[PDB]
Amino acid sequence: PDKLKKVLDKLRLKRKDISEAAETVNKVVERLLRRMQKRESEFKGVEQLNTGSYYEHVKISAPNEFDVMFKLEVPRIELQEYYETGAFYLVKFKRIPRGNPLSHFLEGEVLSATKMLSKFRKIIKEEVKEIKDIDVSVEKEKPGSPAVTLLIRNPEEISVDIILALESKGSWPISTKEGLPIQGWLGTKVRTNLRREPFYLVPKNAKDGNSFQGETWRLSFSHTEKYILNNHGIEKTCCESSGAKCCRKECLKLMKYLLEQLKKEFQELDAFCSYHVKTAIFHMWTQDPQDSQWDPRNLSSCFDKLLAFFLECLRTEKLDHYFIPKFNLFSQELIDRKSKEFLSKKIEYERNNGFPIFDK
Ligand SMILES: [Zn+2]
């Protein structure tokens, strides 16, 4: 019984002390939604987007910290690329003959994330005021993040970041045309079906000056990423009861956990987040698509090749977004070369010493 298997045991046992906070969170948010869906507003159609809630699906956060996405269908979007990489978008509209319901959130031709979020925040504050069963308030707006974060004080303080996402049922942006390269792994029928589902727009400022600040959006495929994580095998029975299990998720978990415990010890690693890990392993799953290449009896070999792949992404400063191939998450504009070299030396140290970081 090696350290890797014991770390996995530790991770799922540590998720036991999350489930009670998670039940609190689910009933707060479904009450808040049901309230928002009864009230008359631009957000009456809001719904929770289910993006998975296990360790593999969630961002790295403290045990009492949660994230949920509120989707809002927005018809007849007209996207304009803000970056040639596909990293950001301005949201305009095609002709809407009966009137754009979001007309009043516009700034010029562009949907203002600032205007939309401000009312999004206001309505929630009012509906959260009217929930008595449970002590729920809303944290004061933070610089930077667009999140409307609930403070649940059922004895222990629990935080919930609510993310507003626009849902568009139009075709996927031109920047995704050659993305989602699953043809040799999940197949062409799956790829065709996934690209027929909606996509989502999350408000996010770019670090580039005053112009269009508060008016920029980034793409989100969290619904697709959940499907892939839960349908990850070449065989349809992979990890099912009449099938064989692989170590794909286990590798993702170990890698997320390695980064998280490195990040809590080195501010140098601030630019790195769990999404870089998920992106890297999406590519490894495309490069090594056979279930037998992720056999559970080869966990440490599979973990190590994932590490060697990540290391090579750092060394060549290239990690293509899995859905937007022009969008390099490891470009120098986004992460200094010195942060990659620092992370590389931290990983090689952990790799060649039995992962001491895993013993705390
Ligand atoms: Zn599997």
138 near 162, Cβ under 8 Å? no
Q: Helix axis angle, 274-287 relative to 248-263, nearest 10°? A: 150
Tokens of 131: 């929930």
Bind-site residues for 2',3'-cGAMP: 67, 144, 161, 204, 218-220
Bind-site residues: 51, 53, 65, 67, 144, 161, 204, 218-225, 232, 238-239, 246, 256, 274-278
Measured distance CA(289)–CA(284) in Å, rounded: 8
What lies within 8 Å, CB to CB, of 21 at 6+ separation is 63, 64, 66, 156, 158
Ligand 1 midpoint to CA 285 (Å): 11
Burial label, 333 (beta-carbon count in 10 A; 0-12, 13-18, 19+): exposed
Amino acid in position 131: I
Q: Helix axis angle, 299-315 relative to 3-14, nearest 10°? A: 90
- Dihedral sign from CA coordinates of 39, 40, 42, 44: positive
- Method of determination? X-ray
Ligand 1 midpoint to CA 298 (Å): 13
Ligand 1 midpoint to CA 102 (Å): 43
Phi, psi of 32 (to 5 degrees): -65, -45
Phi, psi of 6 (to 5 degrees): -70, -35
Q: What's the N-to-C CA distance of the chain in angstroms?
A: 18
Question: What are the C-alpha distances in Å from 126 to residues 120, 138, 159, 169?
Answer: 10, 10, 18, 30
- Kindly report the length of the chain: 360
Q: Which residues pair with 67 in a beta bridge?
A: 161
Ligand 1 midpoint to CA 55 (Å): 16
Ligand 1 midpoint to CA 291 (Å): 7
Domains of the chain: 1-13+172-198+221-360 (1.10.1410.40), 14-171+199-220 (3.30.460.90)
Cβ burial 190-214 (10 Å sphere, 16+ → b, else e): bbeebbeebbbbbbbbeeeeeebeb
Measured distance CA(34)–CA(43) in Å, rounded: 11
What is the greatest pairwise CA distance in the chain?
65
The resolution, in Å, is: 2.4
In 3D, which of 271, 267, 294, 221 has the Cα closest to residue 57?
A: 221
Ligand 1 midpoint to CA 235 (Å): 9
Tokens of 138: 């809303």
Ligand 1 midpoint to CA 230 (Å): 8
Ligand 1 midpoint to CA 282 (Å): 14
Ligand 1 midpoint to CA 186 (Å): 12
Ligand 1 midpoint to CA 288 (Å): 13
Burial label, 325 (beta-carbon count in 10 A; 0-12, 13-18, 19+): middle
What lies within 8 Å, CB to CB, of 18 at 6+ separation is 63
Ligand 1 midpoint to CA 178 (Å): 26
What lies within 8 Å, CB to CB, of 255 at 6+ separation is 277, 280, 281, 303, 306, 307, 310
Q: How far is CA 67 from the centre of its chain?
A: 9
Bind-site residues for Zn(2+): 232, 238-239, 246
Ligand 1 midpoint to CA 56 (Å): 13
Amino acid in position 220: S
Measured distance CA(26)–CA(35) in Å, rounded: 14
Ligand 1 midpoint to CA 206 (Å): 37
How many Cβ atoms are within 10 Å of 313's Cβ, its own excluded? Answer: 21
In 3D, which of 191, 171, 197 has the Cα closest to residue 286?
A: 191
Measured distance CA(131)–CA(24) in Å, rounded: 13
- Dihedral sign from CA coordinates of 247, 64, 279, 354: negative
Tokens of 127: 């509906």
Ligand 1 midpoint to CA 248 (Å): 6
Measured distance CA(168)–CA(172) in Å, rounded: 9
69 near 78, Cβ under 8 Å? no
Secondary structure string (H, E, C) spanning the chain? CCHHHHHHHHHHHHHHHHHHHHHHHHHHHHHHHHHHHHCCCCCCCCEEECCCCCCCCCCCCCCCEEEEEEEEECCCEEEEECCCCCCCEEEEECCCCCCCCCHHHEECCEECHHHHHHHHHHHHHHHHHCCCCCCEEECCCCCCCCCEEEEECCCCCEEEEEEEEEEECCCCCHHHCCCCCCCCCCCHHHHHHHHCCCEEEEECCCCCCCCCCCCCEEEECHHHHHHHHHCCCCCCCCCCCCCCCCCHHHHHHHHHHHHHHHHCCCHHHCCCCHHHHHHHHHHHHHHCCCHHHHCHHHHHHHHHHHHHHHHHHHHCCCCECCCCCCCECCCCCCCCHHHHHHHHHHHHHHHCCCCHHHHC
Ligand 1 midpoint to CA 94 (Å): 43
Burial label, 180 (beta-carbon count in 10 A; 0-12, 13-18, 19+): buried
Ligand 1 midpoint to CA 8 (Å): 16
Bind-site residues for Mg(2+): 65, 67, 161
